[PDB]
Design a protein around this ligand. Structure first.
Ligand code: GTP
Ligand code: GDP
Ligand code: GDP
Ligand code: MG
Lengths: 50, 48, 103, 439, 430, 430
């Protein structure tokens, strides 16, 4: 009896903790693309003139 | 430089004065190119 | 040597003329090599193992002799090598328009 | 952002990974110690190396490759080779005893003491990876440790990761060109194990490439280095699109929906062109039409199989160089028109074409000449069942009287598991026979 | 690292071991004083396979030698390279065997075997990871054939999983030197079949024929035959000590060569062998190596390989060659001689490649074969045994040391069974 | 600083000490004239434990020489390093004990022991902080076994809390030279178990076996046995005199080796031992050292420890080395031979490390074990004693100085109870 509801509670807690990290990791990679973008903007005006 | 790197390999990260001391003691001819064959022979004999 | 003294052309007169030396056949009177000594190690029965002098080592080199080659290389070491990679770098486009010494 | 993980297991896998990573590190211009030679790079490739290399934060780069073997000879040979400062020292896993051409040794007795370590390394690699695209695995099937450890790793990964795509470049035994004597057992069990765990299978037999290099490079005494160089060339041509700009970029995920009609049928064979020496190249033409015609030449394929005995179901071809899409389309039309290559009725469209600007790179000390156009083709055909039928024939002839069975059974291997492999391969060959039946 | 220990017993075993150790010392560049003076670095990468290191930097072989009479040990110490062996591995009796199996296998062998078992145990446990054992001995003699095989059984009881190699100089009727040959030969072959993982038969008159015909010298001596056997034995395990393209260990050889647990008797050969007068006049090609290798006369056994069908063969090429030429030559020799290979096994010849050839040589081929031609040797041994046992000749010397004719009967029946279900596959067809 | 004085009696003890002091002086770099000529300050830092400070910067041993026959003193004075001993410490009787325990313990010993007791009291009071006492003698002789034991009794009465060690040489029935040994041996054992804190059994039979088999030198003398016992004697006390990873004193060894106060008999051994022609072929490493350390025939007692179960064991390592290798070798030898260790006291082995190796060696090991296999010595001694006693043979000599059969009976009963007690703690389980 009890161990059933215990399993549901643990699984629910862990899947919430999982989805939080999922979105948190998702945002960082778009931020990374944007930040490397300006850092690498130096080329392609130079390296294009040549 | 490679002697310093080799010592860093084993973890004996030392400073410049004693690295010159160690290098010069083995480099008897003072040319500046030590022979690690004689180096390893010396250390093997000491370890015997 | 066919019941003869190898200065004659009975069968196998030629390739055995190339014999190295093999001192044993003309020195089987020396015996000697009485050089094991009483080692007192290898062994004891306390008596050391009694030594009987042996004869000459009999030549050897039965396998085909070395054909003056050193060898001792690995196919993987030979195949890649640093030389090709260094050559295909910090070089090239050398046509000797003027004359200049190069390594 | 897109990375793949490369696995090299078995002695053949290691000796092909050597050439693969030689070509890779040369193509992006990386010194063997790993240090970027700077030399006014100003980010010339910019971000084109993260697919295969990861920056250490300051200077050198480390490849995303894992090397597995139980006999330390190849491993410490690599550690004393010329790429000694490149690889991660504890990422080159070396075992204790070789499996010694025994499948059960590497799958039930010795293999379990290394898979945990290998999974740990794969985990720490994937943790650093952020845009993982898939797994590319190399292994020999005619070997004990290769087949066994490959099967165990595929089993573990199929549940630890799941949906991530897996592409395996397997080297099945040649018809008569063969080294070992018990390899039909290892091959049959390994293909049984991988049939339902691997996603893409690529045939890479040996004697076919022997004939290729004999006919094109005119090399009468080729060695395994030429083999590995050709394989690495094929791999780089296949994987260029992920890291280089192109007109029609194709991802590795653009393979399951283009080459796999049914879940069971996922075995294909490759071809590459042009293959020419350095003397017989500079007065020739290397036209797109002639290279794509030579690609479909049956004698030019990488595997010993006659495509004229079977139908075609799918072909994916990658062009690299300055190719013209209109020329590619015209050549494709000519290929479709010419009758000998007959496509199956239910596949009115069968071609997946990719284009990349980057010309192929040549390695110093190599045999291939510097070429300005190339094409690599992967084909799924019903004729591949011939090699399976041949392997089944050999297996039946030697299992008729239970030869070599004791070596397996004494290692914990159960006697009956050979049977289920037999019925499974019978079902697979029957499926291949069925799919070619017209409606 | 996967090191193996050496054990030798009897006169022939001791002499073969001495010559083999001299050959290996020459190969690895270790001097008679035990100090290394080699040239290339590769000589040390697997030096631990055959030698242990001691304080002072000297390397000593891990070989244990054993006999019931001290004369052979006196000889081996006084001979060249006699200072390599540590004094602890010499074990001996004081009485000798006198070519009597019971003397060396029941009373004196049993009372002496404890010390040698202790020595082999400590030597095996000293090294890190075992790989197997190799033995060199004779079956026509007393102390070897009895006490060595007793040691074989004892060590097999204690190490069931390790691989076992025997190099048996099985005596032939043409070169006969003892009348009690059939008795001890039959008993030893009875005891060997259930314990030895691989057996390698060598024949004295076959070696004499090789020396007369190929090497072409009037007056050979046991030194030359020992040298040939040593070269073959060293070529067996080249891959374990040197890098190669297709490495193969002893377990790989056993798996590739053993169809059934009781079919483990092999016949070996070495190439190239040529006379000193024609040393410079021959090319160095894989076709020539294989042509010399597959020749029936080149083999080291009295059995004619062409009187039966090969079950399995293995070759260990050395040097830098091309797998293409190696394997195409293997294919060609398997196709033009389909009559001599049993049909129901495909590609019954295995190849291995090593990068380091013997010093001063480029391409060398060590060949090992499991075929049905070995039947004839056991058949002649059996006919001699029955013709000499039916009259109970020389029987009382055995029966007077706790030996009964029941074990002789069992041994002859077992050898006959080996002959029977060894030749069955010759006529068995798929 | 926790110094210890030396007491020795009998010609046996005198001979042992003559070479023990030579070995110690060599270790500490002391010339025969007593002037320091060492090389490292470690050799000089901890000299006060054994050598006092005499006039002129010289050092004299704090050893007492005591005996009833002065020819032994005359001989030991003229031996090597004989000038070290101060003339005061010599005490001697002019009659002799005559191999008679009664004469050496009641008439002459009682009359003479006052002077030696005064001398030892002076020497003990002179030291700043005394650590303990060590005696060396033989139980087969008269003067030692009587008067040294009486001195032990008085010393234990006078200094209660200090530690006592006794190097006891008991006669084995094989190498016997005296007919009245069982009587005085039993009497000495019964008196000595009353007061001794630690006992080290030493056997001439075992020493002869060691010299015959390990050192393999053809002509052993008493000097070689003295050398072995001197090395073992010095090994146990190394850590008190030199720095190391883990310090350990005699009291620590006693605590870790004494389960019960009546169980204070130990069996000791030293490693490594090799001949002269075998030093080149050995590698001095922890595996070999621990293999020789637990070896049965290595022991310096006739007792086979495989006949019983070890209660406690200790190991003292000399040299510079890593710790885990000692630890894991100990764990492996405990795990692999769990049947020879009693199971209700797990982890019954102690290890200690000192970084100063013996001169001429790089690694050394000293082993002290408390095991139940010692009981067979007392069993056979009691057998001989009762066989001689049922007929009252040689009894009038002992009855001639007031001793009675009550003492013999109670000593026999006391040692029989000790044997039964040792058996009891062996044949017990939780
Ligand atoms: N084309 C090619 N094939 C190779 C190469 N190396 C090994 N192989 C194949 O590998 C097969 C035998 O297996 P191995 O690679 O020798 O060894 P393994 O697969 O690791 O298995 P074990 O022998 O137990 O170690 C041979 O039949 C070859 O076809 C290579 O460098 N090139
Ligand atoms: N090829 C070769 N055979 C040998 C050599 N020494 C002895 N033999 C053979 O050993 C056989 C005699 O074996 P024996 O010494 O009596 O065996 P044991 O009684 O057990 O010691 C003879 O038939 C010889 O042919 C040798 O140096 N070379
Ligand atoms: N280890 C050793 N044992 C000795 C020495 N001298 C005598 N013994 C032994 O002592 C026993 C006799 O003891 P004994 O001399 O009567 O003792 P004491 O009467 O007290 O001097 C003999 O069995 C000898 O084996 C020696 O220098 N070293
Ligand atoms: Mg392998």
């Amino acid at each position: 009896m009890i161990n059933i509801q215990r399993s549901i509670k643990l699984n629910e807690k862990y899947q919430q903790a999982e989805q939080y990290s999922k979105k948190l990791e998702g945002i960082s990679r778009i931020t990374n693309w944007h930040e490397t973008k300006v850092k690498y903007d130096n080329a392609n005006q130079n390296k294009y003139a040549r | 430089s490679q002697f310093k790197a080799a010592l860093e390999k084993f973890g004996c990260v030392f400073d410049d004065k004693e690295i010159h001391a160690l290098f010069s003691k083995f480099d008897v001819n003072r040319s500046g190119k030590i022979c690690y064959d004689e180096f390893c022979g010396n250390f093997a004999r000491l370890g015997s | 040597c066919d019941k003869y003294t190898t200065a004659l052309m009975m069968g196998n007169w030629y390739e055995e003329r190339l014999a190295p030396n093999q001192p044993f056949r003309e020195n089987l009177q020396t015996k000697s090599v009485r050089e094991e000594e009483a080692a007192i190690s290898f062994a004891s029965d306390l008596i050391p193992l009694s030594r009987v002098n042996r004869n000459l080592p009999w030549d050897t080199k039965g396998v085909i002799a070395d054909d003056g080659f050193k060898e001792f290389r690995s196919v993987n070491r030979t195949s890649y090598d640093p030389i090709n990679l260094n050559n295909y770098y910090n070089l090239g486009d050398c046509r000797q328009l003027y004359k200049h010494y190069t390594a | 952002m897109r990375e793949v993980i490369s696995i090299h297991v078995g002695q053949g896998g290691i000796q092909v990974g050597n050439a693969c990573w030689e070509l890779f590190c040369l193509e992006h211009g990386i010194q063997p110690d790993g240090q970027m030679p700077s030399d006014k790079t100003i980010g010339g490739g910019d971000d084109a190396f993260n697919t295969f290399f990861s920056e250490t934060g300051a200077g050198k780069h480390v490849p995303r490759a894992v090397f597995l073997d139980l006999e330390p000879t190849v491993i410490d040979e690599v550690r004393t080779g010329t790429y000694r400062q490149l690889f991660h020292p504890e990422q080159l896993i070396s075992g204790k005893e070789d499996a010694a051409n025994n499948f059960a040794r590497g799958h039930y007795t010795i293999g379990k003491e290394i898979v945990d370590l290998c999974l740990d390394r794969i985990r720490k690699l994937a943790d650093n990876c952020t845009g993982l695209q898939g797994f590319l695995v190399f292994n020999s099937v005619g070997g004990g440790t290769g087949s066994g450890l490959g099967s165990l790793l595929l089993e573990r990964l199929s549940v630890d990761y799941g949906k991530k795509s897996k592409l395996g470049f397997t080297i099945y035994p040649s018809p008569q060109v063969s080294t070992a004597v018990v390899e039909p057992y290892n091959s049959i069990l390994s293909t049984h194990s991988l049939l339902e765990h691997t996603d893409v299978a690529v045939m890479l037999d040996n004697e076919a490439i022997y004939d290729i290099c004999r006919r094109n490079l005119d090399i009468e005494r080729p060695t395994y280095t030429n083999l590995n160089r050709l394989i690495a060339q094929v791999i780089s041509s296949l994987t260029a699109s992920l890291r280089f700009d192109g007109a029609l970029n194709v991802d590795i995920t653009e393979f399951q929906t283009n080459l796999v009609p049914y879940p069971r049928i996922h075995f294909m064979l490759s071809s590459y062109a042009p293959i020419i020496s350095a003397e017989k190249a500079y007065h020739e033409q290397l036209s797109v039409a002639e290279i794509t015609n030579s690609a479909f030449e049956p004698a030019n394929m990488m595997a010993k199989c006659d495509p004229r005995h079977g139908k075609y179901m799918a072909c994916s071809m990658m062009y690299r160089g300055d190719v013209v899409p209109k020329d590619v389309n015209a050549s494709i039309a000519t290929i479709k028109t010419k009758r000998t290559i007959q496509f199956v009725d239910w596949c009115p469209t069968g071609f997946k074409v990719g284009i990349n600007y980057q010309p192929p790179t040549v390695v110093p000390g190599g045999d291939l000449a510097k070429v300005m156009r190339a094409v690599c083709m992967i084909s799924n055909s019903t004729a591949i069942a011939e090699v399976f039928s041949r392997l089944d024939h050999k297996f039946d002839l030697m299992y008729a009287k239970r030869a070599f069975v004791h070596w397996y059974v004494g290692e914990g291997m159960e006697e009956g598991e050979f049977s289920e492999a037999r019925e499974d391969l019978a079902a697979l060959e029957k499926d291949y026979e069925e799919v070619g039946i017209e409606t | 690292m996967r090191e193996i220990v050496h054990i030798q017993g009897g006169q022939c075993g001791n002499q073969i071991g001495a010559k083999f150790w001299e050959v290996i010392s020459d190969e690895h560049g270790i001097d008679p004083t035990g100090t290394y003076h080699g040239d290339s670095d590769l000589q040390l990468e697997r030096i631990n396979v055959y030698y242990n290191e001691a304080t002072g930097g000297r390397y000593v072989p891990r070989a244990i030698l054993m006999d019931l009479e001290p004369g052979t040990m006196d000889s081996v110490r006084a001979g060249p390279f006699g200072q390599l062996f540590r004094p602890d591995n010499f074990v001996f009796g004081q009485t000798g065997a006198g070519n009597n199996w019971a003397k060396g296998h029941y009373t004196e062998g049993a009372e002496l075997i404890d010390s040698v078992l202790d020595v082999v145990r400590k030597e095996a446990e000293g090294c890190d990871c075992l790989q197997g054992f190799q033995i060199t001995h004779s079956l026509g003699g007393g102390t070897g054939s009895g006490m060595g095989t007793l040691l074989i059984s004892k060590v097999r009881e204690e190490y069931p999983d390790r691989i076992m190699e025997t190099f048996s100089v099985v005596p032939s009727p043409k070169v006969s030197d003892t009348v009690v040959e059939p008795y001890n030969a039959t008993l030893s072959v009875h005891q060997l079949v259930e314990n030895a993982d691989e057996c390698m038969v060598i024949d004295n008159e076959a070696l004499y024929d090789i020396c007369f015909r190929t090497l072409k010298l009037t007056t050979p001596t046991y030194g030359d035959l020992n040298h040939l056997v040593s070269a073959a034995m060293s070529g067996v395990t080249c891959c374990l000590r040197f890098p190669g393209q297709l490495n193969s260990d002893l377990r790989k050889l056993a798996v590739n060569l053993i169809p059934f647990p009781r079919l483990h008797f092999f016949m070996i050969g070495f190439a190239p062998l040529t006379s000193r007068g024609s040393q410079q006049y021959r090319a160095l090609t894989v076709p020539e190596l294989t042509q010399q290798m597959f020749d029936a006369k080149n083999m080291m056994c009295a059995a004619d390989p062409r009187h039966g069908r090969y079950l399995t063969a293995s070759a260990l090429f050395r040097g830098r060659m091309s797998t293409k030429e190696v394997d195409e030559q293997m294919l060609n020799v398997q196709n033009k001689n389909s009559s001599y290979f049993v049909e129901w096994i495909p590609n019954n010849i295995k190849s291995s490649i090593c990068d380091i050839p013997p010093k001063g040589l480029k391409m060398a081929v060590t060949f090992v074969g499991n075929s049905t031609a070995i039947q004839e040797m056991f058949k002649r041994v059996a006919e001699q045994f029955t013709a000499m046992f039916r009259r109970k000749a020389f029987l009382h010397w055995y029966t007077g040391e706790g030996m009964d004719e029941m074990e002789f009967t069992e041994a002859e029946s077992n050898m006959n069974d080996l002959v029977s279900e060894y030749q069955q596959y010759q006529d068995a067809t798929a």
